[PDB]
Amino acid sequence: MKYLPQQDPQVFAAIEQERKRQHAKIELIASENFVSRAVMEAQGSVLTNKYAEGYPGRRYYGGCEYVDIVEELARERAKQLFGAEHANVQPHSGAQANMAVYFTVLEHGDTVLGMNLSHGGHLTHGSPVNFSGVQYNFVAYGVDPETHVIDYDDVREKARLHRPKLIVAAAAAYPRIIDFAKFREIADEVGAYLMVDMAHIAGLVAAGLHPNPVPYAHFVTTTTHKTLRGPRGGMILCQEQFAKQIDKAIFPGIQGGPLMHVIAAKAVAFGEALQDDFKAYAKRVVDNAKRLASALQNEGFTLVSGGTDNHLLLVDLRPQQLTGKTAEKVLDEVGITVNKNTIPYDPESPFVTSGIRIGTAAVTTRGFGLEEMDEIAAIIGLVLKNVGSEQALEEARQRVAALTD
Amino acid sequence: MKYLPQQDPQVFAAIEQERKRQHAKIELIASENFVSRAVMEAQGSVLTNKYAEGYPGRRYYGGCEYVDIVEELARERAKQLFGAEHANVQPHSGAQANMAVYFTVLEHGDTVLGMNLSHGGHLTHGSPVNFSGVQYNFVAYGVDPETHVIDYDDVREKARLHRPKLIVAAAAAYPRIIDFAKFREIADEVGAYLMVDMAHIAGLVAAGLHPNPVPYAHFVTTTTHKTLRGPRGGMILCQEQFAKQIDKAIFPGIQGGPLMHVIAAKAVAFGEALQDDFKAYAKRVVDNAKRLASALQNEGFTLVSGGTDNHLLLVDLRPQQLTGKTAEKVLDEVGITVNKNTIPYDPESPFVTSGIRIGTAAVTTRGFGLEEMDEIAAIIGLVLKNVGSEQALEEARQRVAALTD
Ligand SMILES: *Cc1c(COP(=O)(O)O)cnc(C)c1O
Ligand SMILES: *Cc1c(COP(=O)(O)O)cnc(C)c1O
């Protein structure tokens, strides 16, 4: 940076602390990643100066010729990446992408069926403190108590009983492949739309390492960040038949001016994802997750669903008589970043929990591989089996430092 | 830029076109501005990598120590700038700031009283194609047919007849000072909350050149861009008594993860606004607007309300037998950027209009002063009085080029 250090020492000092923190810590929060310098440059551009309400070639303001090129690059690259008929790259966030889809097909108080929040569902899939749970009548399907895999007969029964207008598939904390064909079959049986919220797995979908929801879903929502490794923001994919309605839902429906600089950064990220090396990256993410899962089991940890098919895993800490909160806290002391997370049928509140969620997208971006997964698992074992030993925690701290340099 | 040109030639070429366009054109769109290099650097930072759902010291994820410093810098600087008891700097946009306030105090179908959209009100103040008009029962107050100033007796009568839960004051296209004391008096009479949407005038408020709504309003919403000259995004100000509810409305209410890099940029912009030179800038904005208004009247143009108290003016084109659409188009041909805009009691649709809206915030940032205002007015006169003369348009084009170098 050149101008920020002189103009705002306080803000610069804090940013520099954060940059150094990002390097020093082992980031295992499953939603996190590190974007490229090109992506950052794009959103640090003069495009922040441009109002561009509307869509390419159909804007409310003049002078949009070049931001139109940028937005269409984003849309076309997204369509190639996911094989979708339409893309809307304007959502400010994953939350706003979902909000727009809900606004498109639902009336206030309509019934929606989503994944149980305590089993892996997202806040925006019907939390009573979120707009989704307040505005619409959410009901939940669950995972099997033993296998922790989505119970598709429960999805079907809930759908047939409650007759939802919309079914939501997709999760914030589900370690297995989701069967979108079955979701669509159930949706078809009850005459409901299917929305897939692929935020966590979008990068894996792009790389062909998770089944693509696009052919099965009426609407697909996603973050552009997370496994897709893009700038912070949202996106909606859908068939041509819903394009006009979806576009109107985003604007003038729920948003105002789009963030054109962030949209530029989205284009950059989609460009990166189209490359062969991104596919190699995404395979390492999945390989690393399997390896880490196996290595954690080797340490004696129990994993929700017995492993992982994707970038993320959930440790059930009950065998160690630990809460997620306790584990999260002690790992923070040694430089490993995780988050506490409810496990299916958790006896604890969502604020304490019996689990920690772990993902490999961030460490993989940093170039970590299988050997590093083994060591990460060994450090976690050392820490969680010795929570009262400062000597053990110091050893862990040093081993974490050795990994990050 | 260093990395973007190599990684993504297509995106870079388009960004460069936009940057050159921003320099070449005379930007008179009233909502537009040019942010500092420091602001851009802040939002081009690694803070995009951090999930920070929640609030400073009360986050859902670990590792937020430094983004907490950034967010608190934003909040504290906003509070000093506007004398507010609480700030929420997380809204993704002006639309989301409004959405959050509505979510805080209103139930689905509650009555809200806002400014007539065709008289200066914003889309998010009850358009039937916007969430506001769909989710809530909006009624409108108008401006006087002759003076084009808000008719405060009409505000009062509408309030007393319709008994709104919330009254909204603030505008996208109103050239005069708004009397917030009168709005609060009316709100008090009918037991309604008062929300002031100060997006357009926030920079002028910060500089003490427009009365501050903060002491009179329960809630104040704003963009961080526009006259405040910050990054693209939103903000809410309110008294301590609504702080917890407002914060919950933003998260987990309507948004997910905040844009921490944009919040850093907000802090930078607020820092800039706190400086003496920003106050000088804002006075030049207002001075320039008056001068431009006077110079346009000298050219024979009629202005809505007969002039301006702020950064913006509206030309009533009916005396010239021109629509806003026609004027917008021909000005685009010579390098002057305006937008068509409905005038109060417009005989034309909002898609054709009888007016153009003009603001001075952008040209003032570029260092334009009174002499430039005279010339801009003279060029507009030349163009709009000679719409069928290619020679006149070429002269205008050359004169525009002389202004921008
Ligand atoms: C992360 C996530 C979201 C929310 O995205 P934000 O950008 O944080 O608003 C929504 N749904 C799912 C499944 C997610 O994983
Ligand atoms: C610009 C504006 C908005 C919307 O802000 P976005 O960032 O475009 O969503 C809302 N209200 C008023 C009065 C505005 O001027």
DSSP string, B78-94: HHHHHT-SEEE---SSH
For B233, residues 6+ apart whose C-beta sits below 8 A from its C-beta are B91, B92, B93, B223, B224, B225, B259, B262, B263, B265, B266
CATH number, domain containing residue B142: 3.40.640.10
- The catalytic residues of B are 51, 53, 197, 223, 226, 232
CB contact under 8 A, A257 and B232: yes
Distance CA(A315)–CA(A293), nearest Å, equals 9
- The catalytic residues of A are 51, 53, 197, 223, 226, 232
Q: Are B166 and B104 in contact (CB under 8 A)?
A: no
A399-A402-A405 Cα angle (round to 5): 150
**Residue of chain A whose alpha carbon sits nearest to that of B5:** A38
E strands, A58-175, are: 58-59, 86-88, 111-115, 137-141, 166-169
Point out the ligand nearest to the CA of residue A234: 1
CB contact under 8 A, A50 and B18: yes
Residue A54 phi/psi, 5-degree rounding, is 105, -155
Q: Which atom of ligand 2 is nearest to the CA of B225?
A: 7
CB contact under 8 A, A3 and B44: no
B14 touches chain A (CB under 8 A): yes
Structure tokens at A173: 């904390």
| DSSP strand pairing (B302-303 vs B312-316) | antiparallel
User: Do A90 and A60 reside in the same domain of the chain?
Assistant: yes
Helices A260-273 and A65-82: crossing angle in degrees, nearest 10, is 40
Helix (H) or strand (E) run with residue B138 in it = strand B137-141
Chain B residues whose beta carbon lies within 8 Å of the beta carbon of residue A15: 42, 45-47, 66, 70, 264
User: Do A28 and A51 reside in the same domain of the chain?
Assistant: no
Closest CA to A342 of A381, A311, A366, A314: A314
DSSP string, A341-361: E--TT-SS-TTT-SEEEEE-H
Distance CA(A127)–CA(A33), nearest Å, equals 26
Helices A324-334 and A370-384: crossing angle in degrees, nearest 10, is 110
Breaks in chain B, named by the residue before each, with C–N above 2.5 Å?
Answer: none
Interior/surface letters B74-91, b for 16+ CB within 10 angstroms, e for the rest = bbebbbebbebebbbbbb
User: Do A262 and A299 reside in the same domain of the chain?
Assistant: no
Distance CA(A364)–CA(B191), nearest Å, equals 57
Q: Are B139 and B164 in contact (CB under 8 A)?
A: yes
Resolution (A): 1.7
Give the count of domains, chain A: 2
Which of B283, B314, B337 is the C-terminal boundary of a domain? B283
User: Do A293 and A260 reside in the same domain of the chain?
Assistant: no
User: Do B263 and B324 reside in the same domain of the chain?
Assistant: no
Interior/surface letters A62-91, b for 16+ CB within 10 angstroms, e for the rest = bbbebbbbbbbbbbebbbebbebebbbbbb
Distance CA(B313)–CA(B315), nearest Å, equals 7
Distance CA(B203)–CA(B92), nearest Å, equals 19
For residue B100, how far is its CA from the centre of ligand 2 (angstroms)? 13
For A269, residues 6+ apart whose C-beta sits below 8 A from its C-beta are A35, A36, A39, A224, A228, A229, A230, A231
B136-B220-B252 Cα angle (round to 5): 65
Distance CA(A48)–CA(B36), nearest Å, equals 11
Which of B283, B316, B348 is the C-terminal boundary of a domain? B283
Q: Which of A255, A259, A260, A261 to mutate to test the pocket of ligand 2 (most atoms within 8 A of CB)?
A: A255
Q: Is A289 helix (H, G, I), strand (E, B) or coil?
A: helix
Ligand 2 close to Cβ of residue A253 (< 6 A): no
User: Do B336 and B188 reside in the same domain of the chain?
Assistant: no
CATH number, domain containing residue B297: 3.90.1150.10
Other residues' Cβ atoms within 10 Å of the Cβ of residue B266: 33
Helix (H) or strand (E) run with residue B151 in it = none
CB contact under 8 A, A254 and B14: no
User: Do A194 and A92 reside in the same domain of the chain?
Assistant: yes
DSSP string, A164-176: -SEEEE--SS--S
Q: Is A208 exposed, middle or buried (0-12, 13-18, 19+ CB in 10 A)?
A: exposed
User: Do A221 and A132 reside in the same domain of the chain?
Assistant: yes
Structure tokens at A251: 């604007």
User: Looking at CA atoms only, how far is residue A189 from chain B in angstroms?
Assistant: 30
For residue A49, how far is its CA from the centre of ligand 2 (angstroms)? 14
Nearest Cβ partner for A25 among B48, B63, B69:
B63
User: Do B340 and B233 reside in the same domain of the chain?
Assistant: no
Helix (H) or strand (E) run with residue B33 in it = none
Q: Is B112 helix (H, G, I), strand (E, B) or coil?
A: strand
User: Do A338 and A315 reside in the same domain of the chain?
Assistant: yes
User: Do B227 and B316 reside in the same domain of the chain?
Assistant: no
User: Do A244 and A297 reside in the same domain of the chain?
Assistant: no
Helix (H) or strand (E) run with residue A234 in it = strand A234-238
Domain extent, residue B160, equals 33-283
Please, which residues 82-141 of chain B have a Cβ atom closer than 8 Å to chain A? Answer: 92-96, 99, 103, 108, 123-124, 127, 129-131, 135
Q: Is A19 exposed, middle or buried (0-12, 13-18, 19+ CB in 10 A)?
A: middle
Which of A235, A263, A283 is the C-terminal boundary of a domain? A283
Experimental determination approach used: X-ray
**Residue of chain A whose alpha carbon sits nearest to that of B270:** A8
